């Protein structure tokens, strides 16, 4: 971490730390959105078996460049990282779904 | 439980079930195994009778 | 307002009178304009030695070929031009010759059963022709995967016991049986004392008593022969046969233990286990979500296409068991999980799967019975094996006597432990040994 | 039974089979929905949504659709999902099928009456508003192939389904299941389509048995205002008459000879049913030698083999198809299919007893009153006729119509079928099977 | 390439897993620690089995001969320095192949991660039987120390500690004892490292990322056989600049004086990649505490994948754990530190405090981390 | 333990399998014993006394 923008900053407002923690992250030097990074256990896993055609081969590609600039320990070049503000979640309305299809199947065994 | 014969009433009770099959392999190994010395003991002490030490320590150890 | 347990009392009664040589004359009232007229005797495979195997499917074949009254297809014609449907079925224990017609038409319905029953002709020539028949028929059955398997199971299950024959028998009886053989049979078999004249439908239980005194009251119901002799008992007999061909494409395999028998009420908790289990056949919409957990898994992973649970009720014992259709290389992979199932009912059975084996028993009652053909076998057939025909509301009083402690109880009695009966065909190469099977019956010691 | 000592509980006045049954409860919405509910206080509820979607509404674009649509049952919906439809159902013991036809495709639930509620919400949610995920469908595209393998199996079926073919250029040519280049090609949009122009209310019709009328009433009142659209292969049907043949090396041959009979509800579709059963249509006696049935007989003579002929009689709102079924063996299978349309023509001719019409009218009566006698057959029967007519004819004033069916009436059916543009459909090893044109 | 190959029921397949085995691209060079652990492994068990043709395990013999192996035996001194000084090479290998699980989530691997701490344990325990073998005043004394500990647990402690020993205290039986398991261990660890592989051969390796690598897999052979080489060299490098130029800089000069029980050394202490697990033990004034807590530091690497917070799984693109992360290294630098030195007033708070900070990162602050991070992205 | 959940159909699971796994703890504790002759639990069984 290092200073914050402001002066020093303890803690001031919340989109300015997110802000600052998104490029302290360092996932967007890489051209990934936060959701190409996710860990994928069984539940994410399936939720990228429901991405459409063409948002599942964006993704594919995402990774597949990130990984060759992580094999050359580069990063991409400052016009190329992903903004914070046009970063968008293209798996959150899939992972809700399963998040809900999985806590009705859950309790259904339980009542 | 309800038949005339012996087996009948020893699986039902007990080898009915796997938990219990276990409790008398253990059980009967705790009495098997103190029965089968005394019983295979008393009988090589038979063969061996004043030749052991058992045998001819009375005359020692004095007052003992 | 009329709630489920209002209207099965709503239900008309049974109503069951005697006649003075022993027939049971019995029906249900309802207002259809259509009813069905059928008589019920006790015969079968099982009431035939070696000698006259397989004569009820003979006799049975010959009954509306004519009769005295009405040689040749005169028997047929009445029937067809009256607009009735007429029907024939013979099991190991039963045979049934019911027909469906026009409630107005009750009295020439009950005319014809009592010729066929009576007055059966039994003509040389239709029994040379008849033969060939029954022989071209056993060709036919060859073919059908569920019905020989099944035969399979009977012939060990219950080997060295009559009901390990088969319904329509060997075709070396067919070819040999004779005139002499299937007159003595019916003469010995076909008897007052052991049959049930049974109806439903809108028609009024005084005129079906009043036609049945008309035209039975000549039956006889005398000493004949060892004065309606009684059954015996036949031996369950843990086994396993294995008819292994590989040009057949699927493997179909019957797996079953000894069941209560007619008359136990422990039929009730086993049809809730059962229920819970479940079947499937690779057409169900539901796929992967079934409750029940051998039906979804087998949807998930492919296993079968078809496997289903049945509880075949016979005097003092039964088949109680599963059948499943999967490919060579699953026979193994659901062996052992339909296995496993039935080990869970027997250990450890939850309340609410229960409740759904229960919910799922209620509506096969209630939804089989519909219209008036099911319900006549319904009439019949339990007053040759329960004495009394049980009422719809005293079915929901024991199926609402049982829990999840009942079936835990009731499966471990016949399920947990004991020998079972395999049946095989076709590809089984990969069905596991009897032992594996066996070793299979019982948890944490297999 | 037993809860509380007496509970003489639902010894009510009609309770069904005493005096009064109760009548079958009419009624129309003014959106042009129909309701219909028989209260005839039995355990068993049985509710059926019968909507005008058959599988000849669909165009040449997207064939099949009808069969996915009903294979789409226990799906993902807005108020509930699949796992909760197939749990839901499955845990009160409910039956949820659906049935199709060319014309109509009902949505029918079958539970007790105490839980009918839930089984209700399930069925609107069903039929009014799929969620029709991408995934979702896309997953039961290989169940198509299954179902029609099976489906197909009976080569009785394959025939039906290319006579309809053959006959028919338009909407009721269409097969019943999803043709084999359909299997994978159909889209969710595709579905929303089919279901937001058919599924559409005045198309619609309600029925119900043992549930009171204001409980279908108020369940019903949420509906559509749409009609059906247009169709490159389906819209409105036109016979044209023509022949399909099909060699598959099979031992049995079937065959379908048929002509252009008369639409349901027309005087003259009731000639043609009463001149189904003067030919033959069906055993009465199990194993019997069919002494009455005239087209058995007819090939008996000649014919000392194997063989099977009925009388195919298939009507529909608008056309008909009317013939007789053959089975034979590739060796005699001309002489079966020609001795069999020989006899019709005798017919045609005049050469018809009253006895022989007496029978059939028996026959026709006796059959229809089985078909509703069972819980299920009533409510299809009454769930059709709100679709095709509007209002609930009894069994009685039908068997008045099938009684003032005039002997000459049967005579102009037969010139109908005799005199008009056959169209045959043939299975099997088809090497000596004659020709449209040699009949 | 010279056929259709024909044949493939052998081993060859089993060879499969070396050649054509898909690995992701980005692999960094934090990783030939597995194959260098595979060369520590293989050369500590062939410079020990010629170890042992000269060595003696009974107590009038054993430490002469070791002399003997330097002193007599042709280039036997060499073997003895790569032998003491590869276990040194061992463990720091094995601290980094630690190191690398914690920050790239490679613990998400349950089951390779779960023989991996057996296969830590069973090192452990190797490597502590070996330094008893020379026998040489720190070889008793160390031993005397550690196995006393178990004399804290209750209604075992004093039957066990016997049983451990062969009699009352570390003798002769305890000697001949120790070398003969000293020589069967490592055997079981090459079966446990074959177990340990056939656990992650069914998931593949874990790329720096954390993501899944399946799009960029690269064939082993031409690509990482040739990396591992080059890190082998760099091992043995690193192993033999300490043997040809510093063969005693890690050992303790007081192992070099024949063992004496009557006499005790000026400063009692163990090896140094013990050293971190000294300090927690006596960061603790109770007898029976002491010794949980040297277990429990030890065992706390099984509890790690129980306590994953993070949405991510590599530790790339989180740098408040980044941070936690190099606290932990250097406290337990700081514990290493702690364990060489004598127990005084200056280090007695500082070994409390590093050993409560050691359990409450890993246990407090790392899930708490986690937990933050996740606020911060939204998810 | 023996359940996945805090539900009455794992509570109804915990329950059936509790006296399997009563009597499975007896081989953990008499096994134990009978291994070592544990005297304190050995002095009481009249028979091995
Ligand atoms: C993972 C495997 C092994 C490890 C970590 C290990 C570790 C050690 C260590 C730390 C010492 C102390 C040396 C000193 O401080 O001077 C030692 C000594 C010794 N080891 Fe091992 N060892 C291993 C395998 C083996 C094997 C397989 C053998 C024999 C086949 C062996 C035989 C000996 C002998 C004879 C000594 C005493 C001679 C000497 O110390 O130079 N070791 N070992
Ligand atoms: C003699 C001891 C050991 C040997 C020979 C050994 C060997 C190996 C090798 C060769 C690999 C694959 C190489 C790589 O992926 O970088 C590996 C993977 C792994 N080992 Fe070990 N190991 C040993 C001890 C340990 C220890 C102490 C741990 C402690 C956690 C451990 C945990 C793991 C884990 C988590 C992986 C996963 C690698 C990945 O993420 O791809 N192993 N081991």
Same mark, same amino acid.
């Given at each position: ?21 998104? #490029? ?16 994928? #256990? ?70 | ?64 | ?68 009254? =009405? ?134 239980? =005084? ?200 079936? =835990? ?26 032992? =594996? ?10 | ?121 399930? +069925? ?15 997953? +039961? ?10 489906? +197909? ?148 003579? @000649? ?16 056309? @008909? ?77 039908? +068997? ?30 088809? @090497? ?8 | 390439?010279?056929?259709? *190959? ?36 293989? &050369?500590?068990?062939?410079?020990? &089995? ?20 330097? *002193? ?52 452990? /325990?190797? %490597?502590?039987?070996?330094?008893? &073998? ?111 130029? /510093? ?34 033990? *006596? ?17 706390? &690497? ?10 991510? *799984? ?12 190099? /606290? ?40 708490? %981390? ?10 | ?15 059936? $399998? ?5 009597? $499975? ?8 014993? $009978?291994?070592?002759? $544990? ?11």
């Amino acid at each position: 971490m290092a200073g914050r923008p402001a002066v020093s900053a303890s803690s001031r407002w919340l989109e300015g730390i997110r802000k600052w923690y998104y #490029n302290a992250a360092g996932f967007n030097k890489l051209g990934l959105m936060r959701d190409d990074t996710i860990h994928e #256990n069984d539940d994410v896993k399936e939720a990228i078996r429901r991405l459409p055609e063409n948002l599942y081969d964006d993704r594919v590609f995402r990774i597949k460049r990130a990984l060759d600039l992580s094999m050359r320990q580069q990063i991409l070049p400052k016009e190329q990282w992903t903004k914070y503000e046009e970063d968008k979640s293209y798996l959150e309305p899939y992972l809700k779904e399963v998040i809900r299809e999985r806590k009705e199947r859950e309790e259904w065994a339980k009542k | 439980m309800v038949a005339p014969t012996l087996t009948a009433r020893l699986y039902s009770l007990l080898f009915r079930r796997t938990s219990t099959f276990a409790l008398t392999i253990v059980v009967g190994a705790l009495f098997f195994e103190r029965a089968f010395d005394q019983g295979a003991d008393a009988i090589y002490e038979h063969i061996n009778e004043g030749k052991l030490w058992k045998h001819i320590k009375h005359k020692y150890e004095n007052k003992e | 307002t009329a709630t489920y347990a209002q209207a099965l009392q709503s239900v008309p009664e049974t109503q069951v009178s005697q006649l003075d040589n022993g027939l049971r004359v019995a029906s249900e009232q309802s207002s259809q304009p259509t009813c069905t007229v059928g008589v019920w005797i006790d015969a079968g495979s099982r009431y035939e030695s070696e000698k006259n195997n397989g004569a009820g499917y003979f006799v049975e074949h010959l009954a509306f070929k004519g009769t005295k009254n =009405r040689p040749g297809n005169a028997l047929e014609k009445e029937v067809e031009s009256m607009g009735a449907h007429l029907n024939a079925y013979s099991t190991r224990e039963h045979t049934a010759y019911y027909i469906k017609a026009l409630s107005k038409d009750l009295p020439k319905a009950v005319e014809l059963l009592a010729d066929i029953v009576q007055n059966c002709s039994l003509e040389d020539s239709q029994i040379e022709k008849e033969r060939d028949v029954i022989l071209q028929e056993l060709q036919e059955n060859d073919t059908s995967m569920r019905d020989v398997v099944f035969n399979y199971l009977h012939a060990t299950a219950f080997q060295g016991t009559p009901l390990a024959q088969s319904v329509e028998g060997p075709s070396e009886n067919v070819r040999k049986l004779s005139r002499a053989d299937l007159t003595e049979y019916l003469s010995r078999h076909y008897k007052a004392p052991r049959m049930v004249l049974a109806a439903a439908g809108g028609l009024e239980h =005084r005129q079906l008593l009043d036609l049945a005194q008309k035209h039975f009251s000549g039956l006889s119901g005398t000493y004949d022969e060892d004065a309606v002799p009684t059954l015996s008992p036949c031996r369950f007999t843990g086994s396993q046969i294995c008819h292994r061909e590989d040009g057949l494409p699927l493997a179909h395999v019957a797996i079953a233990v000894e069941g209560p028998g007619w008359a136990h009420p422990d039929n009730v908790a086993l049809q809730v286990a059962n229920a819970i289990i479940g079947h499937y056949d690779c057409t169900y919409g539901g796929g992967a979500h079934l409750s029940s957990p051998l039906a979804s898994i087998a949807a998930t992973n492919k296993l079968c296409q078809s496997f289903q649970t049945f509880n075949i009720c016979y005097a003092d014992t039964g088949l109680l068991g599963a059948h499943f259709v999967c490919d060579h290389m699953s026979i193994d992979d659901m062996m052992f999980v339909l296995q496993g199932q039935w080990m869970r009912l027997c250990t450890s059975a939850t309340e609410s799967e229960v409740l759904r084996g229960k919910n799922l028993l209620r509506n096969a009652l209630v939804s089989h019975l519909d219209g008036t053909t099911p319900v006549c076998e319904d009439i019949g057939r339990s007053l040759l094996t329960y004495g009394r025909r049980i009422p719809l509301a005293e079915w929901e009083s024991r199926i609402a006597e049982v829990d999840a402690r009942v079936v =835990r109880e009731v499966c471990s009695k016949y399920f947990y432990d004991q020998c079972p009966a395999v049946a095989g065909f076709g590809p089984i190469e990969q069905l596991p040994d009897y032992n =594996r099977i066996r070793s299979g019956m019982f948890w944490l010691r297999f | 039974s037993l809860k509380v000592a007496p509970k003489v509980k639902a010894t009510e006045a009609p309770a069904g089979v005493p005096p009064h049954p109760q009548d079958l409860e009419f009624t129309r919405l003014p959106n042009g929905l129909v309701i219909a509910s028989l209260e005839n206080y039995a355990p068993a509820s049985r509710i059926g949504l019968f909507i005008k979607a058959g599988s000849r509404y669909e165009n040449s674009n997207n064939l099949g659709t009808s069969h996915l649509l009903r294979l789409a049952s226990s799906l993902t919906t807005k108020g509930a999902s699949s796992f909760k439809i197939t749990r839901g159902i499955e845990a009160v013991g409910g039956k949820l099928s659906v049935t199709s036809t060319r014309e109509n495709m009902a949505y029918t639930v079958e539970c007790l009456r105490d839980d009918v509620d839930i089984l209700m919400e399930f +069925l609107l949610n069903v039929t009014t508003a799929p969620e029709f995920r991408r995934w979702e469908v896309a997953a +039961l595209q290989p169940q198509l192939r299954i179902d029609k393998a099976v489906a +197909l199996q009976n080569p009785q079926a394959h025939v039906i389904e290319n006579l309809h073919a053959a006959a028919y250029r338009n909407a009721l040519a269409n097969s019943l299941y999803c043709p084999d280049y359909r299997i994978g090609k159909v889209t969710p949009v595709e579905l929303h389509d089919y279901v937001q122009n058919h599924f559409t209310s005045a198309r619609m019709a309600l029925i119900g048995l043992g549930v009171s009328h204001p409980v279908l009433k108020q369940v019903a009142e949420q509906f559509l205002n749409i009609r059906g659209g247009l169709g490159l292969s389906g819209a409105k049907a036109k016979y044209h008459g023509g022949e399909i043949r099909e060699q598959n090396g099979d031992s049995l041959v079937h065959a379908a000879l048929v002509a252009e009979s008369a639409a349901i509800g027309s005087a003259e579709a009731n000639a043609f049913s009463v001149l189904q059963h003067v030919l033959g249509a069906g055993p009465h006696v199990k194993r019997g030698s069919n002494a009455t049935s005239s087209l058995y007989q007819a090939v008996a003579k @000649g014919v000392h083999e194997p063989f099977d002929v009925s009388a195919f009689n298939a009507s529909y709102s608008d056309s @008909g198809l009317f013939g007789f079924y053959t089975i034979s063996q590739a060796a005699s299978a001309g002489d079966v299919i020609k001795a069999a349309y020989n006899q019709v023509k005798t017919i045609a001719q005049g050469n018809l007893s009253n006895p022989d019409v007496q029978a059939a009218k028996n026959k026709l009566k006796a059959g229809y009153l089985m078909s509703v006698e069972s819980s299920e057959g009533f409510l299809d029967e009454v769930g059709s006729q709100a679709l095709a007519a509007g209002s609930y004819t009894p069994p009685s004033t039908v +068997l008045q119509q099938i009684d003032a069916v005039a002997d000459a009436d049967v005579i102009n059916a037969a010139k109908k079928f005799v005199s008009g543009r056959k169209s045959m459909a043939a299975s099997g090893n088809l @090497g000596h099977t004659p020709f449209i044109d040699e009949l | 390439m010279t056929n259709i *190959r024909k044949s493939h029921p052998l081993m060859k397949i089993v060879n499969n897993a070396f050649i054509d085995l898909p690995a992701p691209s980005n692999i960094s060079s934090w990783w030939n620690f597995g194959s260098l652990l595979g060369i520590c492994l293989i &050369l500590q068990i062939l410079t020990g &089995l010629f170890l042992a043709m000269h060595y003696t395990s009974d107590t009038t013999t054993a430490f002469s001969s070791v002399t003997h192996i330097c *002193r007599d035996v042709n280039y036997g001194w060499i073997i003895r320095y790569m032998h003491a000084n590869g276990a040194s090479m061992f463990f720091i290998c094995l601290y980094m192949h630690v190191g690398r699980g914690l920050y790239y989530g490679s613990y998400t691997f349950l089951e390779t991660w779960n023989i991996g701490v057996i296969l830590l344990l069973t090192v452990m /325990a190797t %490597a502590f039987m070996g330094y008893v &073998l020379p026998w040489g005043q720190m070889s008793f004394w160390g031993a005397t120390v550690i196995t006393n500990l178990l004399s804290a647990i209750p209604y075992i402690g004093t039957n066990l500690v016997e049983w451990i020993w062969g009699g009352f205290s570390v003798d002769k039986a305890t000697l001949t004892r120790f070398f003969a398991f000293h020589f069967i261990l490592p055997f079981i660890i090459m079966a446990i490292a074959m177990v340990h592989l056939l656990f992650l051969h069914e998931t593949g390796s874990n790329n720096p990322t954390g993501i899944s690598s399946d799009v960029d897999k690269i064939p082993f052979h031409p690509y990482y056989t040739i990396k591992d080489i080059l890190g082998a060299l760099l091992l043995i490098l690193a192993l033999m600049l300490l043997v040809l130029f /510093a063969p005693d800089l890690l050992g303790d000069p007081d192992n070099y004086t024949p063992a004496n029980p009557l006499n005790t050394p000026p400063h009692i202490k163990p090896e140094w990649y013990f050293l971190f697990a000294y300090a927690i033990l *006596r960061s603790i004034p109770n007898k029976l505490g002491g010794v949980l807590a040297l277990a429990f530091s030890i065992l706390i &690497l099984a509890l790690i994948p129980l306590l994953h917070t993070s949405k991510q *799984r590599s530790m790339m693109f989180r740098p408040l754990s980044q941070c936690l992360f190099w /606290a932990l290294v250097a406290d337990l630098l700081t514990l290493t530190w702690i364990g060489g030195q004598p127990v005084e007033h200056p280090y007695i708070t500082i070994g409390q405090l590093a050993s409560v900070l050691y359990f409450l990162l890993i246990l407090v602050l790392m899930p708490t %981390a986690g937990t933050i991070e996740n606020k911060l992205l939204k998810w | 333990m023996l359940t996945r959940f805090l539900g009455p159909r794992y509570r109804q699971l915990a329950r059936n $399998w509790v006296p399997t796994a009563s009597l $499975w703890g007896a081989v953990g504790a008499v096994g134990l014993v $009978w291994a070592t002759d $544990w005297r304190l639990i050995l002095d009481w069984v009249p028979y091995i006394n």
